[PDB]
Ligand binder design. Sequence first.
Ligand SMILES: Nc1ccn([C@@H]2O[C@H](COP(=O)(O)OP(=O)(O)OP(=O)(O)O)[C@@H](O)[C@H]2O)c(=O)n1
Ligand SMILES: [Mg+2]
Ligand SMILES: [Mg+2]
Length: 443
Amino acid sequence: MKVEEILEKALELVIPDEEEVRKGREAEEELRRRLDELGVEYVFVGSYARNTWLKGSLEIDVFLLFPEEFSKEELRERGLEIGKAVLDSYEIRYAEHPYVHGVVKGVEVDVVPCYKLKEPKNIKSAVDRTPFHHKWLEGRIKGKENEVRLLKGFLKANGIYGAEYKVRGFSGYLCELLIVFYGSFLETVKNARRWTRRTVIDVAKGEVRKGEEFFVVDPVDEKRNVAANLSLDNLARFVHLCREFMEAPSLGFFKPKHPLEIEPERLRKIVEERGTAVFAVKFRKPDIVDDNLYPQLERASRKIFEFLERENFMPLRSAFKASEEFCYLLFECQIKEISRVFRRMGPQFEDERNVKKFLSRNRAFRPFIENGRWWAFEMRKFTTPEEGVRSYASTHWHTLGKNVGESIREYFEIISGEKLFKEPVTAELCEMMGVKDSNSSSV
RNA sequence: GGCCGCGGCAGGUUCGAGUCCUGCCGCGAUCGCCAC
Ligand SMILES: Nc1ccn([C@@H]2O[C@H](COP(=O)(O)OP(=O)(O)OP(=O)(O)O)[C@@H](O)[C@H]2O)c(=O)n1
Ligand SMILES: [Mg+2]
Ligand SMILES: [Mg+2]
């Protein structure tokens, strides 16, 4: 099995065992000890302070509260200083807002400097609302922490948990606001089935209305969309899963699906049977953080895809992969080869000023009249997608994202055929082409 | 870094470009939006 007997067996997958929780309190206790020793004003926020973190994903967030008068430079220089003095080991790789990731007694800790504000109206940093989220949520989320862990685990199992640009899914804070709104995981799933791309969920007003886009209003700042970085597709993937779940509840919805090793021979036969052109652009991964890389991989991939369209290679889907050393942009086209000749439109037969110009241009195959206007046969410069993409990548490297484009300028290569199936892109290829039985939630 | 705007200014392609492609600059009041 029944709807409820499956949620029982699902709590064993999302709730942290007490051996892990204990490891957390010991780290928390030691963190408060060191922070109180430095006489800095701080506050514990996030999934750990609300006890709604997922099993096997323990991470303690700590926000440092600094005076409003501080410069963005003083905030950084002081934030990093405290972070390093509090953490056993640390690491600094941030995107826009400075912070310090590290470890304390074996658990991961984030130390994020922000401004101590009263009323979160005219925020200074992007992270200034986060302490105010905790104030609003702590009183209302009490009792429903496991209903949050169900929604998080559900989303995590189908790869749409995370607001980061690698995922474009549901932030952890968005999940908590949904449970406060619907009361339970089961009630969120039920009502989610009838969401649309114009649904507006105002938690503060206890109201659902229609809008310009999917919009979950922040109780703390009504102008801010909590689900801003949730893509329309991942919105659809969620709504779809909810309809499937209510139709036939299963525990497998909470089981992480990992890919399968697909033999390069079976993969060669799939592409053969499709009769498509499957190739990829390979270049060095720029040394940048993921929230800078993926929006650019998304851009580079799109810019080339749009190129293939207007060049009439009739592309199907695109995809990308980032290994440790290299990045891959994969494409699938219906046209492996097109003619050298195509027909270009000329002027109408009346205005000879324009016609004589059209006919004056030397061509190899002579122009002709059709439906009252002139046409000419022109030649292409490339007749295959690979030849075309080699041209586009070489000349228009600059528009494929700043860092990606700059990497593509220094070096890229077009991999095709079986030489590609040996690359670390099999999973992306199977997802892209809709290959069946290439995933398994098996433990 | 990516994305959305009102704008323009050149260049490329074309018989023909406000309209397709590329480069550059200005301004977004919720110091335009996202990332924690
Ligand atoms: N897209 C995001 C990311 C985070 N935050 C804020 O940052 C806090 C903590 O950051 P994060 O670790 O990313 O969120 P968690 O709630 O801790 O999610 P998780 O369970 O995965 O740790 C959240 O409470 C939230 O208020 C946010 O508002 N919007
Ligand atoms: Mg966290
Ligand atoms: Mg954090």
